[PDB]
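2024-03-11 09:14:02 INFO queue: dequeued item neural cell adhesion molecule, len=99
2024-03-11 09:14:02 INFO validating residues
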Amino acid sequence: RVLQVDIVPSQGEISVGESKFFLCQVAGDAKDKDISWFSPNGEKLSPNQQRISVVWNDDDSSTLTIYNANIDDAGIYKCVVTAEDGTQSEATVNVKIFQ
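2024-03-11 09:14:37 INFO prediction written
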């Protein structure tokens, strides 16, 4: 329809103690748009909870920063956007972590 989303890089391998941010870019113009991030455990993550700090910069672009990385964080993160009526798009990123 209009909503577009893409996380970069597609697959980001990392090591414990290293940081890693994933750029969630978007494209479209289907009414007001929102952004969300879902941790590999099947649940949204907060921006002020742990080493994983989220941020919203551009009109609808948001980066998923993960400072002190851990094997627990290593997983398929998600980036879901939502429309004014309800039409929500999405994206993903295979983030790895080796101890």
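2024-03-11 09:14:37 INFO annotate: The chain is about 0% helix and 55% strand.
2024-03-11 09:14:38 INFO item closed
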